Amino acid sequence: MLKAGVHFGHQTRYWNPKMKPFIFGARNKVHIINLEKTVPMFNEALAELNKIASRKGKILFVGTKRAASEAVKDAALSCDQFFVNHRWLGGMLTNWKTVRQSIKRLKDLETQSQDGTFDKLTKKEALMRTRELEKLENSLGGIKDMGGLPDALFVIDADHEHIAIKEANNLGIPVFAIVDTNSDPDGVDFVIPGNDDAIRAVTLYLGAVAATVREGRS
Amino acid sequence: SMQDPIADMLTRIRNGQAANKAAVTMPSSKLKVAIANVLKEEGFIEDFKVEGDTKPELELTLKYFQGKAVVESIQRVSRPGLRIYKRKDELPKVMAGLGIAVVSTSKGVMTDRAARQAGLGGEIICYVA
Amino acid sequence: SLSTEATAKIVSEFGRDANDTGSTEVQVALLTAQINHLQGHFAEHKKDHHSRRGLLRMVSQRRKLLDYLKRKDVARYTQLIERLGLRR
RNA sequence: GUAAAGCGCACGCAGGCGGUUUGUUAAGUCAGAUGUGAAAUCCCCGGGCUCAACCUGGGAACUGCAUCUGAUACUGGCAAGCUUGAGUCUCGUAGAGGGGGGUAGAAUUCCAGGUGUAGCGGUGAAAUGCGUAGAGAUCUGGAGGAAUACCGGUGGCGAAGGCGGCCCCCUGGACGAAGACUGACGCUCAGGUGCGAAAGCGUGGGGAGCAAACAGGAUUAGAUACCCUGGUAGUCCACGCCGUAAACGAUGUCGACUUGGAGGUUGUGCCCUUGAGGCGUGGCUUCCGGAGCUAACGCGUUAAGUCGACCGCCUGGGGAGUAC
Ligand SMILES: CN[C@@H]1[C@@H](O)[C@@H](O[C@@H]2[C@@H](O)[C@H](O[C@H]3O[C@H](CN)CC[C@H]3N)[C@@H](N)C[C@H]2N)OC[C@]1(C)O
Ligand SMILES: CN[C@@H]1[C@@H](O)[C@@H](O[C@@H]2[C@@H](O)[C@H](O[C@H]3O[C@H](CN)CC[C@H]3N)[C@@H](N)C[C@H]2N)OC[C@]1(C)O
Ligand SMILES: [Mg+2]
Ligand SMILES: [Mg+2]
Ligand SMILES: [Mg+2]
Ligand SMILES: [Mg+2]
Ligand SMILES: [Mg+2]
Ligand SMILES: [Mg+2]
Ligand SMILES: [Mg+2]
Ligand SMILES: [Mg+2]
Ligand SMILES: [Mg+2]
Numbered sequence: 001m002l003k004a005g006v007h008f009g010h011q012t013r014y015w016n017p018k019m020k021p022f023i024f025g026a027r028n029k030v031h032i033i034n035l036e037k038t039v040p041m042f043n044e045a046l047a048e049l050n051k052i053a054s055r056k057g058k059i060l061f062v063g064t065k066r067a068a069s070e071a072v073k074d075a076a077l078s079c080d081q082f083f084v085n086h087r088w089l090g091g092m093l094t095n096w097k098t099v100r101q102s103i104k105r106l107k108d109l110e111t112q113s114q115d116g117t118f119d120k121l122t123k124k125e126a127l128m129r130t131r132e133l134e135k136l137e138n139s140l141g142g143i144k145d146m147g148g149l150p151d152a153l154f155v156i157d158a159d160h161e162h163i164a165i166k167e168a169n170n171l172g173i174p175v176f177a178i179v180d181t182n183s184d185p186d187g188v189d190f191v192i193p194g195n196d197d198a199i200r201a202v203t204l205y206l207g208a209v210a211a212t213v214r215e216g217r218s
Numbered sequence: 219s220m221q222d223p224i225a226d227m228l229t230r231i232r233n234g235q236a237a238n239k240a241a242v243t244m245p246s247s248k249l250k251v252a253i254a255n256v257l258k259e260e261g262f263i264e265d266f267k268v269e270g271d272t273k274p275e276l277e278l279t280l281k282y283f284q285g286k287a288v289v290e291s292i293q294r295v296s297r298p299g300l301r302i303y304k305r306k307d308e309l310p311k312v313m314a315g316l317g318i319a320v321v322s323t324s325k326g327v328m329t330d331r332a333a334r335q336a337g338l339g340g341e342i343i344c345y346v347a
Numbered sequence: 348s349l350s351t352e353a354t355a356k357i358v359s360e361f362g363r364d365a366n367d368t369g370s371t372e373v374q375v376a377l378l379t380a381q382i383n384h385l386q387g388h389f390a391e392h393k394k395d396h397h398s399r400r401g402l403l404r405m406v407s408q409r410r411k412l413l414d415y416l417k418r419k420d421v422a423r424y425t426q427l428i429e430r431l432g433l434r435r
Numbered sequence: 436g437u438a439a440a441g442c443g444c445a446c447g448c449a450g451g452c453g454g455u456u457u458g459u460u461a462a463g464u465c466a467g468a469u470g471u472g473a474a475a476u477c478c479c480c481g482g483g484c485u486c487a488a489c490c491u492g493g494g495a496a497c498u499g500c501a502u503c504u505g506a507u508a509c510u511g512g513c514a515a516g517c518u519u520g521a522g523u524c525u526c527g528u529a530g531a532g533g534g535g536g537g538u539a540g541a542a543u544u545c546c547a548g549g550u551g552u553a554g555c556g557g558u559g560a561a562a563u564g565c566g567u568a569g570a571g572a573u574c575u576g577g578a579g580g581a582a583u584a585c586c587g588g589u590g591g592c593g594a595a596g597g598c599g600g601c602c603c604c605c606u607g608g609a610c611g612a613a614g615a616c617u618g619a620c621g622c623u624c625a626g627g628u629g630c631g632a633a634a635g636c637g638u639g640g641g642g643a644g645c646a647a648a649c650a651g652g653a654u655u656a657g658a659u660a661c662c663c664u665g666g667u668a669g670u671c672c673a674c675g676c677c678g679u680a681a682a683c684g685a686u687g688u689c690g691a692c693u694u695g696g697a698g699g700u701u702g703u704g705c706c707c708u709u710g711a712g713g714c715g716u717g718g719c720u721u722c723c724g725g726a727g728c729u730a731a732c733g734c735g736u737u738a739a740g741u742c743g744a745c746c747g748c749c750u751g752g753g754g755a756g757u758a759c
Contacts, residue, residue: 017694017725219520219622219690221453221744226691229742233692236726236741242692245519247455249509273519274455299452299744301510303464305498324465324506339465341509351525358524362616368524369616377523388534388605396630397533397593401607403446403629408522408620410447415620 001035003208004042007194007201009033011181019181022193033180038193045176045190046209050216052151056080059213060143061206062155062164064088068202072156073142075206079214081154082146084164086138093167096149103144106136152176154209157196158188178205223247225294227254227276228344231263234280235287241279246270252327253320253343254278260318260329262288262346295319295342306339317347349381361430371416372427378409379431 009024009032024034053059061076061083063069069085076083084092092099112118113133118126137144153168155161158177165187168175177188180196195201220226227250234242244250246268254276257263262281269275281288296302304310304321309330312319319330323340333340357380359365361372368377385402389395413434417424428434 014696020694219453219744221622221690222742223454225743230692233741237693239693244691245455252508272517294743296509297743298510301464303509306466322464322508324508326508328508333465337466338506341464343509354524366524367616369522369618371523371617371620374523374617374620385606392534392605395534395606397608398606399533400445400594400630401533404607407446412522412620419618419620 001039003200003204004035004039007198007204008035009181010195010198015181016184018185019179019183019193022179022185022191023181031181033193033195035193041191041193042208045192046212048174048190049152049154049176049209049213053080053213053216054218055151057152057213057216058082058146058148058150059152059154059209060084060093060150061209062088062153062161063157063202065157065160065197067197067199068156068206071203071206075203075210077142078207079210080217081210081213082150083142084139085142088161088164089139090163091167092139092143093149093164093173094171099140100147102136103140106133106140106144109133109136149173155188156202156206158183158185159196162187176209222294222298223250224253224343225297227278228292228294231257231278231280232289232292235282235289238282238287239280241277243269243275243277246274246276249322249327250276252322256318256320256327256329257346260346262318290347291317292344292346294344301341303341304339306334306337309334309339310342310345312345313347317345320344320346349377349384353380361427371412372423375409375412375416375427375433376431378405378412379433381405382409 009030012030013026015023015031022034022037024032024036026032049057049059051057057080059076059081061072061081063072063076063083063085064087072083072085089099109129109132112120112129118130120126149171150173153164153173154176155164156178158165158175158179159182161177162184165175165177167173169187169189174190175188176190176192177183178192178194178196178201179185179188180194183196185191192205194205223245227244230242230244251268254263254266258266264279264281266279267277269277309321310319311317311330315331320343321328321330321333321340322343323333323336323338325336325338327343328336330342354377357376358368358373361370361376362368363370363372367373382402382405389399389402413424413427416427
């Protein structure tokens with residue numbers, strides 16, 4: 001309940017009859033999340049992360065939304081985990097074979113920027129290939145070092161990242177997401193009824209899951 | 219109008235199983251109860267309780283095994299305007315045995331399997347598999 | 348519809364007791380009134396088919412009542428017809 | 436629903452189906468038995484011709500009917516109820532609901548007179564046409580018939596077709612509110628009865644505008660059309676007939692279940708009513724849409740989802756909704 005009392009419900013009244021079971025009660029033009037039933041999910045969910053996280057658990061943190069983005073880079077990286085906060089590529093999970101090829105391209109590109117390996121052709125070609133890395137790292141970077149599908153998957157909101165979840169469960173990859181009112185639980189196999197955003201809520205569980213994950217690494 | 223009360227009870231059950239409804243209510247009656255009983259005794263509904271004093275109800279709770287409902291298929295048989303009476307050797311075998319056929323015998327509302335052995339036939343009612 | 352004064356009045360003459368507009372006898376009578384009274388109106392206009400549709404309903408219903416009365420008490424039925432000179 | 440297929444819509448006899456309780460009965464129903472259900476076939480087991488076909492012993496089967504003895508859950512009969520179905524009473528509410536009679540104002544046309552003068556009218560241009568016998572325009576007065584701008588709506592009423600100025604009279608339905616009352620009197624409905632857009636038909640009225648036909652003027656290769664100038668039926672009224680339509684939601688009626696979001700119309704309750712405000716609880720009605728359904732499009736608590744009672748209809752295209 002501690003930090004829990006810093007996010008509660010959200011989303012006016014659009015909701016979804018699917019979240020109804022996890023919903024607390026409405027108020028001031030908006031229902032609240034039944035944290036009382038969220039507490040079990042708080043731990044139980046994370047209790048399954050450390051498990052597989054024990055062996056360099058390939059935990060893929062997903063969060064493209066503005067807020068989470070600048071945060072995932074830290075928490076999701078402050079441990080043997082992976083983060084994705086820039087436009088979830090179409091198939092970077094299922095179409096790995098084809099997507100990874102992009103990562104490799106990004107790799108070598110870094111070596112160029114690394115030392116005297118990017119000093120080629122006029123500033124023209126430089127800028128041409130330089131800007132290429134930027135964007136390429138924005139999407140592939142947060143997963144460049146992973147020559148294999150993830151063991152798990154922890155995405156912030158199960159809505160904005162819908163595409164991400166869709167692929168996971170399709171390949172048979174356990175997904176952990178924070179579904180709230182205007183969210184669809186049918187997807188994520190590990191419900192986490194909490195504010196889809198909330199500057200505090202996002203960071204709260206972000207670091208919360210991070211620890212429970214880094215700890216599992218013995 | 220309610221020309222067939224039984225059908226309603228049956229339909230209400232399946233309609234709930236799909237809506238994941240906890241339980242279901244409705245005006246009870248001798249037969250409605252008997253049928254609901256066999257449904258519980260056979261393992262299709264947790265339990266059931268008929269409320270109301272002057273106006274009887276029926277708190278019929280739907281059962282669910284795992285990620286699905288226990289009642290996968292339930293339909294009426296000896297419906298009105300077209301009754302159905304089988305012999306002690308005609309009783310149908312629902313779902314090759316994995317199912318049940320609620321039949322009203324001259325000794326009560328039992329299941330096909332039970333009634334069959336007892337050596338008595340009766341009027342079918344539904345095929346809850 | 349019918350006038351309250353004439354309503355309560357007839358409700359008593361056939362009411363099984365004091366204030367019982369539910370009794371079958373009452374209904375039949377109550378209906379027969381609006382019936383014989385409306386004819387006068389229908390004798391005029393005639394082409395008021397829409398209002399005619401209603402009239403017929405009162406008839407059919409009255410029949411469904413009188414029939415019921417006889418099916419559940421041949422006594423009251425026969426006597427009821429008298430004070431109303433209906434069903435021939 | 437769009438492939439063939441929901442009667443254009445209602446009322447309703449026969450018929451089919453019937454909420455709930457106790458008792459009762461035992462007809463349907465279930466059980467047993469006894470007759471009988473020809474033998475032969477068929478079938479199972481077993482015999483005989485070297486085998487097989489074929490022949491044969493026994494049994495099964497003949498799922499049918501009748502009688503006797505039981506059983507009584509369900510259906511049926513009867514008795515007695517009950518109240519949630521259906522209906523009645525009291526008081527209201529909204530409404531282009533229906534039948535009748537009034538009456539207002541806007542405009543059109545026509546007639547009469549004033550003013551006034553060479554145009555008007557029309558088209559893509561024109562032309563027919565109307566004009567110096569004075570049109571058009573403008574004004575004044577009068578006649579006459581038809582329809583009701585605005586309000587007006589993604590709105591309301593109705594069974595359907597359909598139903599718009601205002602006033603009155605006669606009249607039907609729907610909805611709500613508290614109660615009080617009857618006690619399943621219900622649902623569907625072949626046949627049957629009635630209602631039925633417009634066009635059309637009969638008699639007799641009416642006739643401003645519009646307008647099949649018809650007549651001119653254009654266009655065109657032609658133009659028995661589209662366009663223009665005219666114009667008869669009819670359109671309006673009364674009474675009677677005709678019964679069709681893409682009579683369409685192209686979706687029969689009654690009832691019960693099944694996530695949600697948004698908007699309209701109408702009743703009632705309750706609120707610091709302090710207010711528009713907000714909180715309930717009924718009716719009807721639009722849009723989006725989930726599950727599920729569907730061949731797809733799409734339907735989606737007003738289903739085309741999940742079910743029950745009854746009815747109607749389909750069975751390849753053309754010939755033909757024709758012939759007889
Ligand atoms: C004056 N407004 C009325 C309004 O009061 C109401 O009134 C009608 C009334 O106009 C009808 O009358 C109308 O139809 C008659 C033939 N059926 C002929 C007279 C005509 N006014 C009445 N039959 C029914 C009322 N509810 O509904 C129609 C309306 C036009 O909106
Ligand atoms: C779900 N959409 C709804 C739409 O169904 C409709 O809802 C009305 C609601 O406006 C009425 O509300 C009315 O009465 C209230 C006091 N009882 C005060 C507000 C008033 N408009 C309700 N009484 C009945 C609903 N069906 O109008 C409002 C809406 C938001 O668009
Ligand atoms: Mg077609
Ligand atoms: Mg068709
Ligand atoms: Mg129809
Ligand atoms: Mg024989
Ligand atoms: Mg009985
Ligand atoms: Mg309507
Ligand atoms: Mg006509
Ligand atoms: Mg005529
Ligand atoms: Mg929809």
